[PDB]
Design a protein around this ligand. Structure first.
Ligand code: MR8
Length: 107
């Protein structure tokens, strides 16, 4: 599944709804391993639409329980991430992923 652990609290009131654009900064890391991606390094936030199957299941259910301004550690099991096949050349089979996610704004 997905485990959400708060780093910094949000407003505890403004949660994304299905169909909204979430604007986030993230850092992705293989559990007890190597960092693979970060939007912070690129000085440019990532945007996606909740409920439109644009991101892995762990992100869909993880970000949905976050309020605006919240920063949280998301721990995602393989079946909620890339599963048995992984992501070719980057993510191995059966990888547990950890993400540092901050919810910047909704659009
Ligand atoms: C160069 O950076 C790209 C993302 C990279 C790609 C490799 C990943 C290991 C890496 O590092 O992020 C991650 O950190 C990662 O795991 N992410 C990105 C952050 C959100 C969560 C997750 C994810 O779901 O990635 C995904 C991941 C690589 C998608 C996999 C695609 C193949 C499926 O079988 C997988 O099943 C488990 C999910 C990519 C995106 O977040 C991306 C916005 C969506 C894409 C490419 C597709 O949606 C599934 C696409 O399909 C036509 C769209 O609808 C898309 C919104 C259309 C526009 C034109 C494309 C935008 C492309 C954006 C791509 C990026 C920002």
């Amino acid at each position: 599944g997905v485990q959400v652990e708060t780093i910094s609290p949000g407003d505890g009131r403004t949660f994304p709804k299905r169909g909204q654009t979430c604007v986030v900064h993230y850092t992705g890391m293989l559990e007890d391993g190597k960092k693979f991606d970060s939007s912070r390094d690129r000085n440019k936030p990532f945007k996606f639409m909740l409920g439109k199957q644009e991101v892995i299941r762990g992100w869909e259910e993880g970000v949905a329980q976050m309020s605006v301004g919240q920063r949280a550690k998301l721990t995602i099991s393989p079946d909620y991430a890339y599963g048995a096949t992984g992501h070719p050349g980057i993510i191995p089979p059966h990888a547990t992923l950890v993400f540092d996610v901050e919810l910047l704004k909704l659009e």
